[PDB]
Enzyme design. Structure first.
Site, PDB file in Angstrom:
ATOM      1  N   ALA A   2      -0.365   1.422   1.892  1.00 18.29           N
ATOM      2  CA  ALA A   2      -1.101   2.027   0.792  1.00 18.29           C
ATOM      3  C   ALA A   2      -2.571   1.626   0.835  1.00 18.29           C
ATOM      4  O   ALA A   2      -2.922   0.521   1.257  1.00 18.29           O
ATOM      5  CB  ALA A   2      -0.499   1.616  -0.552  1.00 18.29           C
ATOM      6  N   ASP A   3      -3.434   2.541   0.402  1.00 24.97           N
ATOM      7  CA  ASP A   3      -4.822   2.210   0.125  1.00 24.97           C
ATOM      8  C   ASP A   3      -5.000   2.027  -1.381  1.00 24.97           C
ATOM      9  O   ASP A   3      -4.072   2.222  -2.168  1.00 24.97           O
ATOM     10  CB  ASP A   3      -5.773   3.272   0.695  1.00 24.97           C
ATOM     11  CG  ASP A   3      -5.514   4.671   0.149  1.00 24.97           C
ATOM     12  OD1 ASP A   3      -5.595   4.873  -1.081  1.00 24.97           O
ATOM     13  OD2 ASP A   3      -5.256   5.582   0.963  1.00 24.97           O
ATOM     14  N   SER A   4      -6.218   1.651  -1.786  1.00 27.93           N
ATOM     15  CA  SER A   4      -6.443   1.250  -3.173  1.00 27.93           C
ATOM     16  C   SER A   4      -6.222   2.398  -4.149  1.00 27.93           C
ATOM     17  O   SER A   4      -5.815   2.163  -5.293  1.00 27.93           O
ATOM     18  CB  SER A   4      -7.846   0.673  -3.338  1.00 27.93           C
ATOM     19  OG  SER A   4      -8.832   1.553  -2.834  1.00 27.93           O
ATOM     20  N   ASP A  49      -4.009   4.909  -3.477  1.00 29.74           N
ATOM     21  CA  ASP A  49      -2.553   5.029  -3.462  1.00 29.74           C
ATOM     22  C   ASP A  49      -1.916   4.098  -4.485  1.00 29.74           C
ATOM     23  O   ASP A  49      -0.960   4.475  -5.174  1.00 29.74           O
ATOM     24  CB  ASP A  49      -2.006   4.718  -2.068  1.00 29.74           C
ATOM     25  CG  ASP A  49      -2.440   5.725  -1.026  1.00 29.74           C
ATOM     26  OD1 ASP A  49      -2.664   6.901  -1.381  1.00 29.74           O
ATOM     27  OD2 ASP A  49      -2.545   5.338   0.158  1.00 29.74           O
ATOM     28  N   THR A  50      -2.433   2.871  -4.591  1.00 27.71           N
ATOM     29  CA  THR A  50      -1.889   1.909  -5.541  1.00 27.71           C
ATOM     30  C   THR A  50      -2.098   2.376  -6.977  1.00 27.71           C
ATOM     31  O   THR A  50      -1.201   2.239  -7.818  1.00 27.71           O
ATOM     32  CB  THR A  50      -2.530   0.539  -5.320  1.00 27.71           C
ATOM     33  OG1 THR A  50      -2.263   0.099  -3.981  1.00 27.71           O
ATOM     34  CG2 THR A  50      -1.971  -0.480  -6.301  1.00 27.71           C
TER      35      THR A  50
END
Lengths: 411, 77, 411, 77
Positions: B34-36, B38-39
């Site tokens: 995940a990227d930021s 996505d989180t």
């Protein structure tokens, strides 16, 4: 002078999900228009559109990444991937800075604008998706394709409504010819068949309402025409400097020899009359290519099936072609696909290129009774075999907006 | 239908990973790709599924599958 | 080689409603950021933006026509009218086909998209305004200006998010240099300070949330920075072929000598690191102008006040300027105006032009403690008088998108 | 507050003309400078002000100030 050739094609359209399948359906006169069923059209005056059928991008775009993309971005990526694969280009660290993209759209991501605004109205700003902005803005097709292929060259996205397709292709060629790039992926993508799209163009009274017979609704230059028909899809071309293309042994579909632009300087609520803006764009394209109109064998018209606009376009062709107007072939593939808006000029450039390769011209279907004064050869009903055709002209006309024309040359 | 099972299901579809990979000790960024943003999207999906509001300061501490499980655990009854 | 000069300026900004008033406020270090009050910001993490104050277009746009225009269209028209009047150009039937426009926007008409979608959700498609589409799409600033002044030349609208301003200006110059036009009005307009704009950029966690001190929120390269600040406005330039300008006795602010582009080919969720994309755009601009970096006296940075992006931009400047990096002046006027998104590059081109005229450089306010490794001259706090400066560089960087650089030359 | 007065007021602000110019015999297109989309927008404004629904076939017959008055007249009680 740096010459610009076409080395790759990619396309999604209402009549096919590849270039060759679309081209075969168009030459056969097949309509891609059907009743909308992905939202309730009960309250809508227009209940049909040209939809992309059985779209499957799962092998190209994961379901995680699809959720961050409006439909028009998904179409543009898949068409761009088709074009890149068709071109057989190998991107390296050495040439990455010489490859870019010019990909636009007229409306962009209406679907996900609706979804995020609905979320906002029902739950406040904390329900807006973090991907709202990058999932909807028009330059994101180029954004995703440049990342997927590691492209570092010049990248622009022209959003000029119904002429976006020709403008992006034309200026991709300008960038190459100027020396800022050796390769460019160019085209457009559109998915306006949404509640805001159909309702918005329907609010402007611009759409056909022939819900009882959707495949007969788009009828350019026919006396019974009553507005344009929305279509979805995407067209992408890989443009390449000629010597670059020959050095790597690329397949070469056509040469892009001319590009012209103009503005109408009148609102569309005002009479188009003689099509002076459309004529100026064509005239500039001819000057840019250094050819006379009598050398053009086929014109892929704008031909949206609107009462005033179709007639003004016929006058613009008469103005440019003069004595040769009776001989030149003109047709509107929008009779089969509907109006792909910002992607219209992109898929229609492809049709103009393949017409040179196959020496065959797609028809204007539904042209049962032409208007008085719509006496050109509009290739009604059935495709036309030709021979010796060396130049084609692809038009996108705003009739109350901007205009663009591209001239393609065989081999 | 089990909150642990429900949380893992949400994480799996949000991050595009098979259920076998959504282990209790997996971190979204280091393990599940995940990227930021996505989180952020994942926490919102958890909020939507369990009809709860996760404040910003608490959302930032939800970095692993176990943390998401423990948070939805102690905010029901 | 056809040279391109700037003969007219027009601007609306958070610190002024004209070019000269904006320029004076910026040189004085005045902040234009304030609390939003045109919608309820209670649920929004970010409650402030750079707003156009006391905007009055009634003498230019009737109230009837204002209702058909989102705010960003109104800003763009007023700035364009300012530019046309400043240029003193007389449009005739003879030269109308040689004058066009290149005017874009990053988001377009979010305000009226919200209004029409709200109408749709509450009342169905028959409540959508017939002007919905033409009131919101990005190319409509050019559309209205070309009609108001009777312009028939090439007209495009580039929508490349935060680099739209430089791309439109740069390609207006390309069109002129290529010979398709002698005059072009170019720039951008933005009004994203709406519920969808603030919520959308806030959903992406990109905005500063320093609601307690909005004028200190935008602090590029400061250790306490926490995201960018939205700003509204528009900038327009009248570009002209040099001989055309001299023949009619135009006022000439500067020459546009260089334009470079590039793509990052990485998502913004990935580390920017060295700013290789920004460096490539600058390098291409320098090559296009035929000058070395050491001749640039002032760089109008992108400088959005984002943690990773500000640092990567500082590395890009170090890369291009090398030994001269310690001497060149760099500043971000976004410290005062906020980020005007698609109009940012347009108003900042104007700032770079006026810096040459007045030999003064606007400051980066709020730069109280620079980051370790942000050791360039960022002109903190107070404007800097200069002498002998002949070239300025205007940058718009996507840091996860496209890049553009323009080089202007004195006289 | 008078439907005739109310209709003229709506027409005046929609078409950007002074109340003195909104005469009973004025046509929107020939006299008050409206285009075909202005006329659509005007009918919608009339629908919104009088909380009524004007069908498409009837809306097309509302071309003058008097026609708009007569329509809102005979669709209340």
């Amino acid at each position: 002078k740096r010459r610009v050739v076409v080395t790759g094609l990619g396309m999604l359209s209402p009549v096919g999900n590849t270039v060759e399948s679309t081209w075969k359906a168009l030459l056969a006169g097949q309509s891609g228009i059907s009743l909308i069923d992905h939202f309730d059209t009960s309250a809508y005056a227009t209940k049909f559109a040209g939809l992309v059928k059985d779209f499957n991008c799962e092998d190209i775009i994961s379901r995680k990444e699809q959720r961050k993309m409006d439909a028009f971005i998904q179409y543009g990526i898949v068409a761009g991937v088709q074009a890149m694969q068709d071109s057989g280009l190998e991107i390296t660290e050495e040439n990455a800075t010489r490859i870019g993209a010019a990909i636009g759209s007229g409306i962009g991501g209406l679907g996900l604008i609706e979804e995020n605004h609905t979320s906002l109205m029902n739950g406040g700003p904390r329900k807006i998706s973090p991907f709202f902005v990058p999932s909807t803005i028009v330059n994101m097709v180029a954004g995703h394709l440049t990342i997927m292929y590691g492209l570092r060259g010049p990248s622009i996205s022209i959003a000029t409504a119904c002429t976006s397709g020709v403008h992006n292709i034309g200026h991709a060629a300008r960038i190459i010819a100027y020396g800022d790039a050796d390769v460019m992926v160019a085209g457009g993508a559109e998915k306006a068949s949404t509640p805001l799209g159909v309702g918005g163009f329907g609010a402007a009274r611009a759409l056909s309402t022939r819900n009882d017979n959707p495949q007969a609704a788009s009828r350019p230059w026919d006396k019974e025409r009553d507005g344009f028909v929305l279509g979805d899809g995407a067209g992408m071309l890989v443009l390449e400097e000629y010597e670059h293309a020959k050095k790597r042994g690329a397949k070469i579909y056509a040469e892009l020899v001319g590009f012209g632009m103009s503005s109408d300087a009148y609102h569309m609520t005002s009479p188009p009359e003689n099509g002076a803006g459309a004529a100026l764009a064509m005239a500039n394209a001819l000057r840019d290519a250094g050819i006379e109109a009598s050398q053009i064998g086929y014109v892929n018209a704008h031909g949206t099936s609107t009462p005033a606009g179709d007639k003004a376009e016929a006058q613009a062709v008469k103005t440019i072609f003069g004595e040769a107007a009776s001989r030149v072939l003109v047709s509107s593939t929008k009779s089969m696909t509907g109006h792909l808006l910002g992607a219209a000029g992109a898929v229609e450039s492809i049709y103009s290129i393949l017409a040179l390769r196959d020496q065959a011209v797609p028809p204007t279907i539904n042209l049962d009774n032409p208007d008085e004064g719509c006496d050109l050869d509009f290739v009604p009903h059935e495709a036309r075999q030709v021979s010796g055709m060396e130049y084609t002209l692809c038009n996108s006309f705003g009739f109350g907006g901007t205009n663009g024309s591209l001239i393609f040359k065989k081999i | 239908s089990t909150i642990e099972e429900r949380v893992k299901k949400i994480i799996g579809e949000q991050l595009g990973v098979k259920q076998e990979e959504v282990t209790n000790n997996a971190s979204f960024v280091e393990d599940l790709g995940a990227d930021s943003l996505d989180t952020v999207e994942l926490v919102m999906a958890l909020e939507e599924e369990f009809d709860t509001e996760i404040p910003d300061e608490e959302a930032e501490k939800i970095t692993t599958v176990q943390a998401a499980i423990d948070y939805i655990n102690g905010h029901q009854a």
